[PDB]
Design an enzyme around this catalytic site. Structure first.
Site, PDB file in Angstrom:
ATOM      1  CE1 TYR A 119      -2.630   3.341   1.004  1.00  0.00           C
ATOM      2  CE2 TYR A 119      -3.458   2.180   2.943  1.00  0.00           C
ATOM      3  CZ  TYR A 119      -3.456   3.295   2.119  1.00  0.00           C
ATOM      4  OH  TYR A 119      -4.249   4.362   2.459  1.00  0.00           O
ATOM      5  CB  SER A 169      -5.336   2.218  -4.664  1.00  0.00           C
ATOM      6  OG  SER A 169      -6.027   3.443  -4.584  1.00  0.00           O
ATOM      7  CE1 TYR A 170       1.986   5.751  -2.025  1.00  0.00           C
ATOM      8  CE2 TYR A 170       0.469   7.623  -2.245  1.00  0.00           C
ATOM      9  CZ  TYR A 170       1.760   7.121  -2.061  1.00  0.00           C
ATOM     10  OH  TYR A 170       2.821   7.993  -1.957  1.00  0.00           O
ATOM     11  CG  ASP A 183     -10.625   3.894 -11.167  1.00  0.00           C
ATOM     12  OD1 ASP A 183     -11.066   4.808 -10.428  1.00  0.00           O
ATOM     13  OD2 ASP A 183      -9.777   3.048 -10.786  1.00  0.00           O
ATOM     14  CG  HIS A 238      -9.991   2.952  -7.275  1.00  0.00           C
ATOM     15  ND1 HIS A 238      -8.869   2.985  -8.077  1.00  0.00           N
ATOM     16  CD2 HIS A 238      -9.542   3.024  -5.999  1.00  0.00           C
ATOM     17  CE1 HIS A 238      -7.791   3.073  -7.320  1.00  0.00           C
ATOM     18  NE2 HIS A 238      -8.172   3.101  -6.055  1.00  0.00           N
TER      19      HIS A 238
HETATM   20  C1  LIG Z   1      -7.267   3.765   0.942  1.00  0.00           C
HETATM   21  N1  LIG Z   1      -8.182   4.863   0.545  1.00  0.00           N
HETATM   22  C2  LIG Z   1      -9.591   4.733   0.956  1.00  0.00           C
HETATM   23  C3  LIG Z   1      -7.596   5.914  -0.216  1.00  0.00           C
HETATM   24  O1  LIG Z   1      -6.438   5.828  -0.648  1.00  0.00           O
HETATM   25  C4  LIG Z   1      -8.630   7.069  -0.627  1.00  0.00           C
HETATM   26  C5  LIG Z   1      -8.867   7.876   0.671  1.00  0.00           C
HETATM   27  C6  LIG Z   1     -10.127   8.495   0.837  1.00  0.00           C
HETATM   28  C7  LIG Z   1     -10.432   9.214   1.993  1.00  0.00           C
HETATM   29  C8  LIG Z   1      -9.491   9.345   3.047  1.00  0.00           C
HETATM   30  C9  LIG Z   1      -9.899  10.086   4.258  1.00  0.00           C
HETATM   31  C10 LIG Z   1     -10.625  11.396   4.181  1.00  0.00           C
HETATM   32  C11 LIG Z   1     -11.028  12.062   5.306  1.00  0.00           C
HETATM   33  C12 LIG Z   1     -10.707  11.473   6.617  1.00  0.00           C
HETATM   34  N2  LIG Z   1     -10.993  11.902   7.851  1.00  0.00           N
HETATM   35  C13 LIG Z   1     -10.454  10.923   8.605  1.00  0.00           C
HETATM   36  N3  LIG Z   1      -9.882   9.950   7.880  1.00  0.00           N
HETATM   37  N4  LIG Z   1     -10.056  10.277   6.693  1.00  0.00           N
HETATM   38  C14 LIG Z   1      -9.614   9.561   5.483  1.00  0.00           C
HETATM   39  C15 LIG Z   1      -8.201   8.743   2.909  1.00  0.00           C
HETATM   40  C16 LIG Z   1      -7.896   8.015   1.729  1.00  0.00           C
HETATM   41  C17 LIG Z   1      -7.988   7.989  -1.727  1.00  0.00           C
HETATM   42  N5  LIG Z   1      -8.834   9.132  -2.048  1.00  0.00           N
HETATM   43  C18 LIG Z   1      -7.778   7.112  -3.002  1.00  0.00           C
HETATM   44  O2  LIG Z   1      -8.658   6.362  -3.393  1.00  0.00           O
HETATM   45  N6  LIG Z   1      -6.603   7.219  -3.625  1.00  0.00           N
HETATM   46  C19 LIG Z   1      -6.403   6.744  -4.977  1.00  0.00           C
HETATM   47  C20 LIG Z   1      -4.967   7.134  -5.330  1.00  0.00           C
HETATM   48  C21 LIG Z   1      -4.228   7.436  -4.046  1.00  0.00           C
HETATM   49  F1  LIG Z   1      -3.562   6.288  -3.671  1.00  0.00           F
HETATM   50  C22 LIG Z   1      -5.281   7.698  -3.034  1.00  0.00           C
END
Ligand SMILES: CN(C)C(=O)[C@@H](c1ccc(-c2ccc3ncnn3c2)cc1)[C@H](N)C(=O)N1CC[C@H](F)C1
Ligand SMILES: CN(C)C(=O)[C@@H](c1ccc(-c2ccc3ncnn3c2)cc1)[C@H](N)C(=O)N1CC[C@H](F)C1
Ligand SMILES: *[C@@H]1O[C@H](CO)[C@@H](O[C@@H]2O[C@H](CO)[C@@H](O)[C@H](O)[C@H]2NC(C)=O)[C@H](O)[C@H]1NC(C)=O
Ligand SMILES: *[C@@H]1O[C@H](CO)[C@@H](O[C@@H]2O[C@H](CO)[C@@H](O)[C@H](O)[C@H]2NC(C)=O)[C@H](O)[C@H]1NC(C)=O
Ligand SMILES: *[C@@H]1O[C@H](CO)[C@@H](O[C@@H]2O[C@H](CO)[C@@H](O)[C@H](O)[C@H]2NC(C)=O)[C@H](O)[C@H]1NC(C)=O
Ligand SMILES: *[C@@H]1O[C@H](CO)[C@@H](O[C@@H]2O[C@H](CO)[C@@H](O)[C@H](O)[C@H]2NC(C)=O)[C@H](O)[C@H]1NC(C)=O
Ligand SMILES: *[C@@H]1O[C@H](CO)[C@@H](O[C@@H]2O[C@H](CO)[C@@H](O)[C@H](O)[C@H]2NC(C)=O)[C@H](O)[C@H]1NC(C)=O
Ligand SMILES: *[C@@H]1O[C@H](CO)[C@@H](O[C@@H]2O[C@H](CO)[C@@H](O)[C@H](O)[C@H]2NC(C)=O)[C@H](O)[C@H]1NC(C)=O
Ligand SMILES: *[C@@H]1O[C@H](CO)[C@@H](O[C@H]2O[C@H](CO)[C@@H](O)[C@H](O)[C@H]2NC(C)=O)[C@H](O)[C@H]1NC(C)=O
Ligand SMILES: *[C@@H]1O[C@H](CO)[C@@H](O[C@H]2O[C@H](CO)[C@@H](O)[C@H](O)[C@H]2NC(C)=O)[C@H](O)[C@H]1NC(C)=O
Ligand SMILES: *[C@H]1O[C@H](CO)[C@@H](O[C@@H]2O[C@H](CO)[C@@H](O)[C@H](O)[C@H]2NC(C)=O)[C@H](O)[C@H]1NC(C)=O
Ligand SMILES: *[C@@H]1O[C@H](CO)[C@@H](O)[C@H](O)[C@H]1NC(C)=O
Ligand SMILES: *[C@@H]1O[C@H](CO)[C@@H](O)[C@H](O)[C@H]1NC(C)=O
Ligand SMILES: *[C@@H]1O[C@H](CO)[C@@H](O)[C@H](O)[C@H]1NC(C)=O
Ligand SMILES: *[C@@H]1O[C@H](CO)[C@@H](O)[C@H](O)[C@H]1NC(C)=O
Ligand SMILES: *[C@@H]1O[C@H](CO)[C@@H](O)[C@H](O)[C@H]1NC(C)=O
Ligand SMILES: *[C@@H]1O[C@H](CO)[C@@H](O)[C@H](O)[C@H]1NC(C)=O
Lengths: 728, 728
Positions: free
Chosen positions: B509, B592-593, B670, B702
């Site tokens: 990850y 993803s990441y 996606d 995605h």
């Molecule tokens: C694991 N995950 C849910 C994520 O990585 C997604 C992600 C989405 C939302 C949050 C997020 C937002 C607000 C928050 N308040 C407390 N925790 N928290 C987490 C953190 C990560 C991200 N937007 C994504 O899909 N990509 C895609 C490319 C890049 F890797 C990030």
């Protein structure tokens, strides 16, 4: 010892094929590029001079993509900033150079982003298309005259074709026709106002943050087609009036009742133009022959000069009604049409008489009419030795039809069986282009006595190189099925031994009027697979194939995805029974229609094939364009042929793909066969749990011809094939 | 002799983990759905009663997606016609059923295609969003009051979030917040007017002739962001004669000076609301505490009650500023913030005091505040045994911060090291959800003396089935890198023999604040790989990972694609030196990441990995959304951080892929990480002549979670890994 023909050799093009591309500028002189500079040659003696030294446009500040000399030799059109579009369309910039005063014209220049430009047939008049409107320049340095004001991107096309007319009808971007001496300029106008748009992403260089959405009017099967109108303007009146009138020539009532197409434009004389129209149900076409009425400045087509051409067994023409060739006086013409037997031959027509007279006949066909003089008509046919895959030049005496001389048959019967020709302006000289079964050979000939003048290019240099390589051999033969014979060819590995079992790759196209079995010499991927991987690569022309009469060609009428698919399977069976084929290692692959057929075969459940590759395939006919699809399938409605449209998809055979190894490949910017088609195949396979291999090519179109992608795709396919046959 | 956990077992879920999802409805009772029935449980004794018959809607017609009982238990909202949109958003149809009069309300019903609905925190008022506008119903059967009228598809969003705010800020579609007793209704309004749109094709069912183009306001890095406004309306004084009045609360001036975001909204009392604003440069945020002025009717936010939160080493909060937890009277609150050592702890704030006081401290972190009473604050931390990958429930005496009691650490140390909690209304009771390292265990407890009332679900059925299968083991440990310890986990095959060489797959990850090394029990792909394929599956948390302080988490600030990538290679390097790892068979994969790090690793030229798989990876940061990307990378402009945006792409490393086997997968639909990202990767690979494997999934997003696609992708990747490792 002796190296084999490898993949790198093919991809890097180490063994080059030389050719001799000349441009007839008169009745006995032609142009030829020799070392960046342009030479003019005297056909009669072979002597020459430097027409334009390569260092002429050194400090031009632009790379010149192509050039064009006006008919009168007074000017040269320089094309640069070439930007490809579809198969034939592109945009470019242009500058005109005055050959006499050796200066480049810098005033009243052709606009940038010009869609099409053509010199008048005589003199140095110019007609061009910019922003979908037509313009005419009487003189290179004078202001242009606007002909149309309706031009509108993706809506109204004046003088140029829309996507579907360009691809399926005129095989060209231009839709304008100068009369023989240049007085008149005729053109077509296309309206795509209600034509549905195909949309797809184009990613471009990684610097583009947001992908671009390409949108092009493209009528799929059964969708709203573009309409069309035809006009003729008198260019000699332009400098006398403020706004010269484009006189419209309407389609005949028999066409106006329904959707139709303009399928041919051919001038007959200075004041007579012929037009052929085709009903959306492509089995009925009409030719109007129109004359200029000097007192009304109008154009009239007498119903007494109207000619009807229809088919009870299929569509009209191989792909569209054939073009007429008029005698000087424009009172009669020759046209290739299907005879009572279903074989295409030359019919002689009086313009105001409905019954024509066939001047050729037999169980073979005329490919095309090449030249017409007051004494002889020259044509290419596959009559020689009853080989539908050969092509030869013939001459027929107009005053005595029983007098037919073959001009190319015996020139070098063992090395040359596939000919092409190019006559000088008045057909005083002709260049013969032999392209198989041996190395291509180009020769020049004199028409007055049919004597060989000299050899232009024999490819001795390549023959020299090919001597040190284990080249494969080619077999062109036939097998008999239900009394009729069907041809096939095999690229056989070096030192072939029929006591052994070779793996076999079935190379297929099989679309209507296709021919994969011929006498042409090719250096391609099959060459490498046979020479290096000892794989037999075969092709077969079964039902639906061309040049063998309508009984064979029209067999798939309204039924694509059947006989041409089945016959390909039967072909493999026949080959295995030849004893030198390993029934356990039989693959199949095809591109475009070949991909569709390959997919349909891989999903038939025949058990004959182990694996297959489909590149840019059609997956369901409703996804392809109207003009081509409907030609063979009619309309996708319940009252017409909908049941067969829905029964001939690749997706419905998804379940049978469990029995084979499949590799699906498609370019994402394919504007012809939309990526959509493979996207639906992959989805149907995922849906029934079938594993397969896939590869997309970013921003590549139907040709996947980009240098890097080309090499990348043939490399990827090689691995897949070698693995399937476990060589390794 | 005992089966193994196969691929089919993972794809068909033959081994189901049991859960116990309850819903607190008061300080002493909860709802639990059993056999499609809804029962109400008394926490103290465990006795229950049926609350709603599974057959009550036996003849409802539509298939009910979900239910939601009003806080007073008088009504129940029925959800159906569910249609998913993004990660949290969807539209649906609703119906209200009166539990008292056992009737289904038919007058003045919620519209179809409703975007969001929610009961008021107390009683039974409703608030819903339809066509982007906000509506309120004081009574289920009475007509609703229109609160907003500016709602416009893809442009103005009232009460609901746009794409970026849904995904990266609120992790919900909802953008309205009821006040504690339902008197006030607060909401945000988003304007995406100048936000560019991402566009991609959607193919749909085979029957759709023309692919549709999806268009969604999505701001990529550096692009124009949506703007936001905040409003509060009194629902107790709504008139059907006059249009509701919404009072706006503007962001502070330190925020209005430039682009910014609304990042948190938390009510403190019936008349006090707090808001946290964040600058586009995400290292400075502001909290406003606003009180309702009874005479004025306006909401005033005293500057003296402003709280600034900033970071000199990175961004603010783990992903955004944490939520405050106000005391009963709303005069003070608790909030998790990074302390001077860089560790996230709980700070106690006075609303009109600039300095807060940390009540916890140490080289570990608080994950979240879970419950607050006047004597205790309950929270989860990873303090126990110094294991950053463990989670336990703690309580701290508000009158003496030295009195910290762990409530879960010792319940069952061998089976439980990772807890989650759910308190009842006044924290009188709490449910503990243990999820590892052994099978999930759910228990109920009472706060007064922290008694263990009863076991709700111990998954003994699953345990019984698992004893007949050769399950893998999990090793959680750490390695040291420059005086710093970093943790990793290894999923080890059954009968692990440290004297043998096992192939190894690195599951990565590595995103910012990520954690892939924990004590959570999981049944996934890695389980099958280890159990059946005898492949060790490792994960490592390097620089950039979370829950270990900013010194580690902020190591990648303004530097994505550097340390976190380098650290994975170092970990593999270390694992490849251990006696039980076959250094000739080390793979890596991520989604993803993770797909980005995996691709960056494969293109690093380290030579450590033989093959790798990237699913929906980010390829260059300018393609990803602004809120997430800019948080870590700053702006992509020359005066900011453009150079690193350009140096951290997958594409620039294309050439280094010649030495590895790469499989690139991506769904064409996606909306999160656009297909574009993989399209640019494939094109760059093609450009340097590097062969690779690819697979696109038509219409998948995605998560590539549809049943068929899910099964298909894991089947395909399994074949890939086994082949890379020479496994039958
Ligand atoms: C694991 N995950 C849910 C994520 O990585 C997604 C992600 C989405 C939302 C949050 C997020 C937002 C607000 C928050 N308040 C407390 N925790 N928290 C987490 C953190 C990560 C991200 N937007 C994504 O899909 N990509 C895609 C490319 C890049 F890797 C990030
Ligand atoms: C081989 N070839 C050039 C073709 O198949 C393309 C094709 C294009 C133009 C013609 C064509 C059009 C007019 C014409 N007048 C005389 N010959 N002639 C040939 C014939 C075929 C076709 N439009 C295509 O790309 N697909 C793709 C799917 C389906 F197989 C047909
Ligand atoms: C090819 O060579 C011939 C023979 O030298 C050239 O013939 C010209 O013939 C015309 C008319 O018959 C004479 O007036 C000229 O004197 C000849 N040319 C010269 C330069 O004297 C012919 O010009 C040559 N053609 C080319 C293209 O080089
Ligand atoms: C192209 O065809 C369209 C019809 O498909 C023509 O548009 C119509 O024009 C008339 C006259 O102004 C209007 O009353 C109609 O409402 C139009 N229909 C549509 C669908 O736009 C158009 O005139 C044609 N263009 C040309 C240059 O011939
Ligand atoms: C030249 O003549 C054409 C045709 O008569 C003019 O085109 C017309 O323009 C008017 C208004 O400008 C439109 O209402 C008509 O629909 C057009 N007809 C056609 C066939 O396009 C054109 O504008 C004239 N050009 C000039 C410079 O006068
Ligand atoms: C090209 O052909 C046109 C059409 O025949 C010629 O124009 C005619 O010329 C005759 C003179 O013999 C006139 O009587 C007519 O009025 C013209 N018709 C039109 C429509 O213009 C033209 O002269 C020919 N061009 C050349 C160079 O011969
Ligand atoms: C929720 O809290 C609000 C705000 O404190 C209460 O409304 C106030 O009630 C008092 C006493 O009746 C009135 O004098 C105020 O004028 C009200 N203020 C406003 C802004 O309306 C409300 O009563 C509470 N709701 C419930 C259900 O208890
Ligand atoms: C928040 O981060 C920004 C960006 O890193 C800091 O602002 C400046 O950023 C530029 C480069 O973009 C540097 O040249 C400056 O040295 C940075 N500082 C200042 C004062 O301009 C900003 O300092 C950070 N804010 C806090 C509170 O740490
Ligand atoms: C759980 O059990 C208690 C009794 O042990 C139930 O009884 C309480 O509530 C009833 C109505 O809800 C009353 O009839 C009882 O008088 C009352 N008893 C006490 C001691 O308070 C309670 O309802 C049960 N709850 C559920 C959900 O079944
Ligand atoms: C939504 O935002 C837009 C701007 O992003 C607001 O419109 C502004 O921009 C218009 C053109 O883009 C200008 O003409 C105006 O100066 C300005 N206001 C108006 C009314 O056009 C738009 O009003 C915003 N909408 C809402 C409901 O706030
Ligand atoms: C939302 O959609 C449903 C279904 O279309 C509407 O319910 C009725 O459905 C029947 C058939 O199921 C139709 O005959 C009616 O036209 C629909 N409407 C009514 C009033 O009967 C429902 O009403 C719709 N509601 C809203 C707010 O859109
Ligand atoms: C023409 O240009 C080529 C370079 O492409 C050069 O080798 C050749 O000698 C030139 N010939 C003349 C006549 O300029
Ligand atoms: C065409 O483009 C060139 C390059 O920008 C420009 O300098 C020139 O003036 C243009 N010519 C015309 C006719 O517009
Ligand atoms: C043309 O084809 C249609 C469709 O099969 C048919 O119904 C019609 O009779 C045909 N016309 C001719 C002249 O064959
Ligand atoms: C409710 O229905 C479910 C299936 O729909 C069934 O399993 C269950 O037994 C029913 N509940 C009761 C209490 O019978
Ligand atoms: C409420 O406001 C909207 C738009 O601003 C207006 O169209 C509508 O008529 C108003 N209704 C009343 C009752 O004022
Ligand atoms: C310490 O270790 C880090 C990696 O954790 C390394 O990059 C760095 O160069 C080392 N030295 C210092 C002084 O940080």
């Amino acid at each position: 010892t002796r190296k084999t023909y490898t993949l790198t050799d093919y991809l890097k093009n180490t063994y080059r094929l030389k050719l001799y591309s000349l441009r007839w500028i008169s009745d006995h002189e032609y142009l030829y590029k020799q070392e960046n500079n342009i030479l003019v040659f005297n056909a009669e003696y072979g002597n020459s001079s430097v027409f334009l030294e390569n260092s002429t446009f050194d400090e031009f500040g632009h790379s010149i993509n192509d050039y064009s000399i006006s008919p009168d030799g007074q000017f040269i059109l320089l094309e640069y900033n070439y930007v490809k579009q579809w198969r034939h369309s592109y945009t470019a910039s242009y500058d005109i150079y005055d050959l006499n005063k050796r200066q480049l014209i810098t005033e009243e220049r052709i606009p940038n982003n010009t869609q099409w430009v053509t010199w008048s047939p005589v003199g140095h008049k110019l007609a061009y298309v910019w922003n979908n409107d037509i313009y005419v320049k009487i003189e290179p340095n004078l202001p242009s005259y606007r002909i149309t004001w309706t031009g509108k991107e993706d809506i109204i096309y004046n003088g140029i074709t829309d996507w579907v007319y360009e691809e399926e009808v005129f095989s060209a971007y231009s839709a304008l026709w100068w009369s023989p001496n240049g007085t008149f300029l005729a053109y077509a106008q296309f309206n795509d106002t209600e034509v549905p748009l195909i949309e797809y992403s184009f990613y471009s260089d990684e610097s583009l943050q947001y992908p671009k959405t390409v949108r092009v009017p493209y009528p799929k099967a059964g969708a709203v087609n573009p309409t069309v109108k035809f006009f003729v303007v008198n260019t000699d009146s332009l400098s006398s009036v403020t706004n010269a009138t484009s006189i419209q020539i309407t389609a005949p009532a028999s066409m106006l009742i329904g959707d139709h197409y303009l399928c041919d434009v051919t001038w007959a004389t200075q004041e007579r133009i012929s037009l052929q129209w085709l009903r959306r149900i492509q089995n009925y076409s009409v030719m109007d022959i129109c004359d200029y009425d000097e007192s009304s400045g109008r154009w009239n087509c007498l119903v007494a000069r109207q000619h009807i051409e229809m088919s009870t067994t299929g569509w009209v023409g191989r792909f569209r009604p054939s073009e007429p060739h008029f005698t000087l006086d424009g009172n009669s013409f020759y046209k290739i049409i299907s005879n009572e037997e279903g074989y295409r031959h030359i019919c002689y027509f009086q313009i105001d008489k409905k019954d024509c007279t066939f001047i050729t006949k037999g169980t073979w066909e005329v490919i095309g009419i090449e030249a017409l003089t007051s004494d002889y008509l020259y044509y290419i046919s596959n009559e020689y030795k009853g080989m539908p895959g050969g092509r030869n030049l013939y001459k027929i005496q107009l005053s005595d039809y029983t007098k037919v001389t073959c001009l190319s048959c015996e020139l070098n019967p063992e090395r040359c069986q596939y000919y092409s020709v190019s006559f000088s302006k008045e057909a005083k000289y002709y260049q013969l282009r032999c392209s198989g079964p041996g190395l291509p050979l180009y020769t020049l000939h004199s028409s007055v006595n049919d004597k060989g003048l000299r050899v232009l290019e024999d490819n001795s240099a390549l023959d020299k190189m090919l001597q040190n390589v284990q080249m494969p051999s080619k077999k062109l033969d036939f097998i008999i099925l239900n009394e009729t014979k069907f041809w096939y060819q095999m690229i056989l590995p070096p030192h072939f031994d029929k006591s052994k079992k070779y793996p076999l790759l079935l190379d297929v196209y099989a679309g209507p009027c296709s021919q994969k079995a011929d006498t042409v010499f090719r250096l391609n991927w099959a060459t490498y697979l046979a020479s290096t991987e000892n794989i037999i690569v075969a092709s077969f022309d079964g039902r639906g194939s061309g040049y063998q009469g309508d009984k064979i060609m029209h067999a798939i009428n309204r039924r694509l995805g059947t006989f041409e698919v089945e016959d390909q399977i039967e072909a493999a069976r026949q080959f295995s029974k030849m004893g030198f084929v390993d029934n356990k290692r039989i693959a199949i692959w095809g591109w475009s229609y070949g991909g569709y057929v390959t997919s349909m075969v891989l999903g038939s459940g025949s058990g004959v094939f182990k694996c297959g590759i489909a590149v840019a395939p059609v997956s369901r006919w409703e996804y392809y364009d109207s003009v081509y699809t409907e030609r063979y399938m009619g309309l996708p409605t319940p009252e017409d042929n909908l049941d067969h449209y829905r029964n001939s998809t690749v997706m419905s055979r998804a379940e049978n793909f469990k029995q084979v190894e499949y590799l699906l490949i498609h370019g994402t910017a394919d504007d012809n066969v939309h990526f959509q088609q493979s996207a639906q195949i992959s989805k149907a396979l995922v849906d029934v749990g079938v594993d397969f291999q896939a590869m997309w090519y970013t921003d590549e179109d139907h040709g996947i011809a980009s240098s890097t992608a080309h090499q990348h795709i043939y490399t990827h396919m090689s691995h897949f094939i070698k693995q399937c046959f476990s060589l390794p």
